[PDB]
Amino acid sequence: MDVMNRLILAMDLMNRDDALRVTGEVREYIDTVKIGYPLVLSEGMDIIAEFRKRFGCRIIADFKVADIPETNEKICRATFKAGADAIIVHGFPGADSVRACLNVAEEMGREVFLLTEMSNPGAEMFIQGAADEIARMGVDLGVKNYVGPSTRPERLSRLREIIGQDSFLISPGVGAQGGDPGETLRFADAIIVGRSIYLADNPAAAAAGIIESIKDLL
Amino acid sequence: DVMDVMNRLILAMDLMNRDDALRVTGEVREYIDTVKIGYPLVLSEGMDIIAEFRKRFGCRIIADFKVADIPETNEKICRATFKAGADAIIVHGFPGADSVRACLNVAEEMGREVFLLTEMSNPGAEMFIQGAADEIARMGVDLGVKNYVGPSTRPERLSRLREIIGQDSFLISPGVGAQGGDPGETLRFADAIIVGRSIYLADNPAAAAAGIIESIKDLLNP
Ligand SMILES: O=c1cc(O)n([C@@H]2O[C@H](COP(=O)(O)O)[C@@H](O)[C@H]2O)c(=O)[nH]1
Ligand SMILES: O=c1cc(O)n([C@@H]2O[C@H](COP(=O)(O)O)[C@@H](O)[C@H]2O)c(=O)[nH]1
Ligand SMILES: [Cl-]
Ligand SMILES: [Cl-]
Ligand SMILES: [Cl-]
Ligand SMILES: [Cl-]
Ligand SMILES: [Cl-]
Ligand SMILES: [Mg+2]
Ligand SMILES: [Mg+2]
């Protein structure tokens, strides 16, 4: 996947007018938008096609898919029907649940991203101890796209070691949660950035500033 | 007090088009006053489907969204979900206490309920979730969670979950029917069973529901 400026916008504003306006303000800087449940549950799945119509951007549906295989299949189908190019899936529920997502993605010409360790402090309780094994499970299942935490660069580096240089790795927790853009890009192919951009007084200047700080990594 | 689930039976309405979902739910309305609506239906038909169910049926709505994000995003998901009219939301515990707390805080503010999913019913649950489940359950109890979800497909596990959360906590359990769980045996430990396909794919969903209820007749409350 070829992400402009190695920067993915996490568009978690919850009203259509603001989400569209702010995305428009930063469109020159990005070509990849992560759309999650805050926006989708507030404005409907039609928002995905509308982003494509307005911006032509690729869309990653961050739905943290975490159900049994039968339900995971249905969620992936509904998500790809709405025009998402990729979907983010939890590994914690086990291999069968991940395989269910991989199957639908293959059928519809899309990608699965496997979330292995989360960026919140609570991730230390249960996920972190399973994360290396979840990553190896990804490798075993043929997963090529991964998500890992900007807030723990040593853990992000370990994830990169496990998955290899050929796999694609994106990383949230940059800015608001404390992660550094440049340090994160030592290990991740692309950084995910939400609030630092979409809640900034001037979102365009914020995006430009982040890009300036990583200009020698582009 | 806990939610009063008619016949101890919750419909998992995972049909993906509005017409079929509405028809089947209407067909079983005399048996079931509590419906679990998940992402298969919501992502296909929109959050207004919750409104439509409320309008058409006299049914409580549990939003099965397995909320599993960071605290900031979890809050937003819960707010949008309760705004749409869900009585309760199901959240994962494996992302940690902060993520669960975020949901509980919104539910408290908004006058709604959180259900904590501690273990899952799929075979894959043995890989990672099973080993964390007792601690996830204990964490729920420590956080003041009152409502829980655990798997009918593993009776010994469901029994242990009931022990951890105590008799006062409310426990619902999926995996009955299609996944192999038995209604009566599950109700030894769960307050209510969740049933999807063996009702909604039946030639006569009403007959299927009635049949499940007949098999557990002596377990209903006066
Ligand atoms: O471990 C993870 C996985 C995520 O998808 N995310 C998501 O990435 C985004 C982070 O946004 P922000 O830059 O505002 O912190 C949010 O949409 C969040 O749900 C995360 O923060 N941590
Ligand atoms: O561990 C769990 C947790 C669930 O919510 N579920 C949900 O319960 C329902 C089970 O439906 P069914 O009776 O068709 O197997 C589905 O909506 C599924 O997503 C489950 O099967 N296992
Ligand atoms: Cl399944
Ligand atoms: Cl925590
Ligand atoms: Cl957070
Ligand atoms: Cl498995
Ligand atoms: Cl068992
Ligand atoms: Mg609306
Ligand atoms: Mg720099």
Tokens of A130: 């399973």
Chain A partners within 8 Å of B76 (Cβ): 12, 14, 37-38
Q: Find, among A120, A129, A101, the residue nearest to A173 by Cα.
A: A120
| Cα–Cα distance for residue pair A136/B60, rounded to 1 Å | 42
H-run or E-run covering B173: strand B170-173
Helix H or strand E segment including B61: strand B60-67
- With contact defined as beta carbons under 8 Å apart, do B192 and B5 qualify? yes
Closest residue to atom 12 of ligand 2, CA basis = B196
Q: Given its phi and psi angles, is residue B46 left (phi above 0), alpha (psi -120 to 50 degrees) or beta?
A: left
A91 phi, psi to nearest 5 deg: -95, -20
Q: How many CB atoms lie within 10 A of CB B108?
A: 12
Chain B from 105 to 124: CB within 8 A of any A CB: 120-124
Q: What is the DSSP letter of A126?
A: T
Could you tell me the CA-to-CA distances from B122 to A69, A94, A109, B71, B119 in Å, in that order?
Answer: 7, 8, 26, 26, 9
Atom of ligand 1 nearest to the CA of A12: 17
Which residue range(s) make up the domain with B157?
1-222
A36:B69 CB<8 A: yes
Structural contact between residues A121 and A167, judged by C-beta atoms closer than 8 angstroms = no
Yes or no: say if A84 and A61 are a contact pair by the CB < 8 Å rule. Answer: yes
Are the beta carbons of A123 and B95 closer than 8 angstroms? Answer: yes
Closest partner CB to A118 (pick from B70, B121, B129): B70
Structure token pair of residue A44: 């409907």
> CA gyration radius for chain A?
16
Nearest CA distance, B222 vs chain A (angstrom): 35
Q: Per residue, what are the HEC states of B82-138?
A: HHCCCCEEEEECCCCHHHHHHHHHHHHHHCCEEEEECCCCCHHHHCCHHHHHHHHHH
User: What is chain B's Cα-based Rg?
Assistant: 16
Phi, psi for residue B72 in degrees, rounded to 5? -60, -40
CA gap A74, A57 in Å, rounded: 25
Question: Does B111 show up as a binding residue in the annotation?
Answer: no
Per residue, what are the HEC states of A72-94? Answer: HHHHHHHHHHCCCCEEEEECCCC
Q: Mapping DSSP to helix (H, G, I), strand (E, B) and coil, where does residue A159 land?
A: helix
CA distance linking residue A156 with residue A158, whole number of Å: 5
For residue A64, indicate whether it is catalytic.
yes
DSSP letter at B167 equals S
How many Å apart are CA B80 and CA B116, to the nearest integer? 18
Conformational region of residue B202, where left means phi above 0, alpha means psi within -120 to 50, and beta covers everything else: beta
- Could you tell me the sign of the dihedral formed by the alpha carbons of A29, A195, B94, B2, in that order? negative
For chain A, the residue count is: 218
Experimental method of this PDB entry:
X-ray
Cα–Cα–Cα angle for B50, B55, B61, nearest 5°? Answer: 40
Cβ neighbours, 10 Å, residue B180: 10
Tally Cβ neighbours within 10 Å of residue B139: 21
- Nearest ligand, measured from the Cα of B126: 6
Q: Among A48, A97, A119, A126, which would you mutate to test the B interface (most chain B Cβ atoms within 10 Å of its Cβ)?
A: A126
Contacts of residue B213, defined as CB under 8 A and 6 or more positions apart, other chains included, come to B7, B9, B31, B220
Q: Which of residues 46-85 of A touch B (CB under 8 A)?
A: 63-64, 66-69, 71, 74-75, 77-79, 81-82
Helix axes A95-108, A127-141, angle to 10 degrees: 50
- This structure's resolution (Å) is 1.3
Closest CA to A117 of A158, A70, A83, A65: A158
Domain count, chain B: 1
3-state helix, strand and coil shares in percent for chain A, rounded to the nearest 5: 50, 20, 30
- In A62-152, alpha helices (H): 69-81, 95-108, 127-141
Instruction: Output the domain CATH number for residue A27.
Output: 3.20.20.70
